Structure formats: C-alpha cells, structure tokens
Amino acid sequence: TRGTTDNLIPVYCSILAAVVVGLVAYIAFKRWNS
Amino acid sequence: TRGTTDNLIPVYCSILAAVVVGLVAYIAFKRWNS
Numbered sequence A, B: 001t002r003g004t005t006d007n008l009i010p011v012y013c014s015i016l017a018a019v020v021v022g023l024v025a026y027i028a029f030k031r032w033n034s
C-alpha cells in the first residue's frame, strides 16, 4: 500500500489547489462575518 | 499545448506549494486578528 496512499502527490496538487482556493474565500468570509 | 507557456504544470506545483503553504499561516493569522 505505498503506490495508493503516498503516490497521490500529483493528484494532491490538483485537488488541494481547488480546495485551498475555495477555502481562502470561504474561511476568510466565515471569520469576517462570524 | 504550445509546450513553452502551458507546459509549466509541474514547475507551478513547486513554487505554488511553497507560496500557498507559507500563505496558509499568514492569511489565516490576518483573517483571525481582523
């Protein structure tokens, strides 16, 4: 189970770029409107 | 896919991972102290 848990490095940079960008606007608006 | 403008997919992940990681601490602290 080394090629299916810690080989997601190329896939992470894709999903993490989409999630982190959506988080920057969401988390900020949540902490600004809290 | 010119190969000299839209081939920088892996190189972006390098600088983007280093910038976005350093930003996760800064943006969070700025939005938390706001």
Ligand SMILES: O=C(/C=C/c1cccnc1)c1ccccc1O
Binding pocket: A009, A010, A011, A013, A014, B009, B010, B011, B013, B014
């Ligand atoms: O092989 C890599 C994968 C990057 C990537 C970037 C975006 C979407 N899918 C994959 C890679 C990641 C970080 C730095 C250099 C790399 O070659």
